[PDB]
Amino acid sequence: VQIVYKPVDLSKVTSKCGSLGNIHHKPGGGQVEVKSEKLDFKDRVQSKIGSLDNITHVPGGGNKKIETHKLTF
Amino acid sequence: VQIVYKPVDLSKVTSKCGSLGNIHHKPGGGQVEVKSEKLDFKDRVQSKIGSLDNITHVPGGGNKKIETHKLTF
Amino acid sequence: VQIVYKPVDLSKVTSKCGSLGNIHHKPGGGQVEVKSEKLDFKDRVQSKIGSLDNITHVPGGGNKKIETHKLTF
Amino acid sequence: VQIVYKPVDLSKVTSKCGSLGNIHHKPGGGQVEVKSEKLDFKDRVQSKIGSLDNITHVPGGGNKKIETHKLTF
Amino acid sequence: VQIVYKPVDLSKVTSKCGSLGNIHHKPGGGQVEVKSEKLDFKDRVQSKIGSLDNITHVPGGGNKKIETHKLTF
Amino acid sequence: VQIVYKPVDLSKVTSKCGSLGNIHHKPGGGQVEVKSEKLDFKDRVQSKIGSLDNITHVPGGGNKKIETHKLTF
Amino acid sequence: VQIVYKPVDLSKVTSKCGSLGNIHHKPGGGQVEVKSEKLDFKDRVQSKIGSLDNITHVPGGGNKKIETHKLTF
Amino acid sequence: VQIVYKPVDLSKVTSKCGSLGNIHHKPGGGQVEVKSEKLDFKDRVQSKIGSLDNITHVPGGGNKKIETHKLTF
Amino acid sequence: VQIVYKPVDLSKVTSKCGSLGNIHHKPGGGQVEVKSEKLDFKDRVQSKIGSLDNITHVPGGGNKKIETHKLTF
Amino acid sequence: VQIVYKPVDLSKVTSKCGSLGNIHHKPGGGQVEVKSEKLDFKDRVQSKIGSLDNITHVPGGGNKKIETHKLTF
């Protein structure tokens, strides 16, 4: 049994931008109310309960390359 | 048994932009109310309960390349 | 038994934009009310309960290439 | 049994930006109230309960390359 | 049984930015109230309860490369 | 010339209420936009321009008696 | 010329209430925008321009008696 | 010329209340924007421009008696 | 010419309340923006420009009697 | 010419309250921005520009009697 795994990746993920700006984010407050009793989180649990979040994200690039290589024998 | 895995990727994911701007995000508050009793989250659980979130996302690029390579023997 | 896997990808996903802007997002608040009792989330569960979210997304590019390669023997 | 794992990655994830700026983030406060009784978090649990967070993120680049290589025998 | 693991990575994650600035972050305070009784956190638990955080993050670069190599015999 | 003005008022305006309650008022926000140029208000002018008001009025009584007595010679 | 002005008022404006309560007022924010140029208010002018007001008024009584007596010779 | 002004007022404006309470007022923020150029207010001018006010008024009584007596010769 | 002004006022404005309480006022912040150029206020001018006020008023009584007596010869 | 001014006032403005309390006022911050150039206030001008005020007023009584007596010859 002979297994050869040799994928080739010469790809390009790119961007160019002249001018990025004059970005205004102005949230008018607000009310969040959460009521619960018992929280039992067992395995690989990701959670957010009760939030009023404000996020401004302005990267010059922000490009992504995600890759998975899985070989199982 | 001979298995050869050698995919070739020379692809391009790209963008160009002159000017990006004059972006206004102004949420008028609001009310969120959540009531529950028992939360049992067991395996690989991702959750958001009770939220008033405001997100402004203005990347110059924001391009993505996602790739999965899975070989099972 | 001989298996050869060698797909070739030289593709292009691209964009060009002169000017991107004068984007206004102004939500007039609002009310969200959610009532529940028992939440049992077991495996690979993604959820959002009770939300008033505002998202402004203005990428210069925003192009995507998604690819899956699965070989099972 | 012969297994050869030698993937090749010569990829590029890049960006260029002339000018990035005039970014304003001005949250109008707000109210967050969370009530619970028992929190039992057992294994690999990531959580946020009761928050009013404000995040401004403006990287010049912000590009990402994420890669996983898993070989199981 | 012969196993050879020799992946090659000559990739590039980069950015260039001329001018980054005039970034204003001005949160209007706010109220956060959290009430609970019993918190039992057992293994690999990461959590935040009751917060009003303000984060301004403006890196010149901020690029990331994350890589995992796992071989199990 | 003899003028006699002597009206007699022994009237009663009354109310009785056992229990007043469980009153819920929950407006779902909304948008109001008003555009004008020149406002010239000269004499005894009462006005409201551009509003999103919410009024809850729950008096135990709220009874009124309005009376005008005008004698002109 | 003889003028006699002697009106008699022995009236009653009253109320009785056992229990007044469980009153909830929860406005969902909202947006108000007003644009004008020239405001010229000359005599006895009462005005409100551009508002998002929330009023909760719960008097135990709230009864009123308004009376005007005008004699002109 | 004989003028006699002698009005008689023995009136009663009253209230009684057992229990007044459990009153909740929770505004969900909101946005108010007002733009103008020239404001010329000359005589006896009462005004409010650009507001987001929240008023909770819960008097035990709150009864009123307003009276005007005007004699002109 | 004989003028006699002798009005008689033996009136009563009153209230009684057993218990007044459990009053909650919780504003969710908000945004107020006002732009103007020239404000010329000449005589007996009362004004409020640009406000986000929160008033809680809970008097045990709060009763009022307002009276005007004007004689002009 | 004989003018007699002798009004009689034996009125009562009163209140009684057993228990006054459990009053909570919790403003969620907020943003107020006011821009102007020239403010010319000439005679008997009362004004407030640009404010975020919070007032809690809980008098045991709070009753008022206002009276004006004006005789002009």
From Swiss-Prot, chains A, B, C, D, E, F, G, H, I, J:
Modification type Phosphoserine: residues: 19, 47, 51
Residues with N6-acetyllysine modification: 6, 12, 16, 26, 38, 42, 64
Disease: In Alzheimer disease, the neuronal cytoskeleton in the brain is progressively disrupted and replaced by tangles of paired helical filaments (PHF) and straight filaments, mainly composed of hyperphosphorylated forms of TAU (PHF-TAU or AD P-TAU). O-GlcNAcylation is greatly reduced in Alzheimer disease brain cerebral cortex leading to an increase in TAU/MAPT phosphorylations. Frontotemporal dementia 1: A form of dementia characterized by pathologic finding of frontotemporal lobar degeneration, presenile dementia with behavioral changes, deterioration of cognitive capacities and loss of memory. In some cases, parkinsonian symptoms are prominent. Neuropathological changes include frontotemporal atrophy often associated with atrophy of the basal ganglia, substantia nigra, amygdala. In most cases, protein tau deposits are found in glial cells and/or neurons.
Location of cross-link Glycyl lysine isopeptide (Lys-Gly) (interchain with G-Cter in ubiquitin): 6, 12, 16, 26, 38, 42, 48, 64, 70
Glycosylation sites: 42, 48, 64
Outcome following mutation: residue 64 to I: In PIDB; 90% reduction in the rate of microtubule assembly
Tissue specificity comment: Expressed in neurons. Isoform PNS-tau is expressed in the peripheral nervous system while the others are expressed in the central nervous system.
Post-translational changes noted in the entry: Phosphorylation at serine and threonine residues in S-P or T-P motifs by proline-directed protein kinases (PDPK1, CDK1, CDK5, GSK3, MAPK) (only 2-3 sites per protein in interphase, seven-fold increase in mitosis, and in the form associated with paired helical filaments (PHF-tau)), and at serine residues in K-X-G-S motifs by MAP/microtubule affinity-regulating kinase (MARK1, MARK2, MARK3 or MARK4), causing detachment from microtubules, and their disassembly. Phosphorylation decreases with age. Polyubiquitinated. Requires functional TRAF6 and may provoke SQSTM1-dependent degradation by the proteasome. PHF-tau can be modified by three different forms of polyubiquitination. 'Lys-48'-linked polyubiquitination is the major form, 'Lys-6'-linked and 'Lys-11'-linked polyubiquitination also occur.
First and last residues shown, out of full length: 623 to 695 of 758
Biological role: Promotes microtubule assembly and stability, and might be involved in the establishment and maintenance of neuronal polarity. The C-terminus binds axonal microtubules while the N-terminus binds neural plasma membrane components, suggesting that tau functions as a linker protein between both. Axonal polarity is predetermined by TAU/MAPT localization (in the neuronal cell) in the domain of the cell body defined by the centrosome. The short isoforms allow plasticity of the cytoskeleton whereas the longer isoforms may preferentially play a role in its stabilization.
Name the UniProt record assigns to this protein: Microtubule-associated protein tau
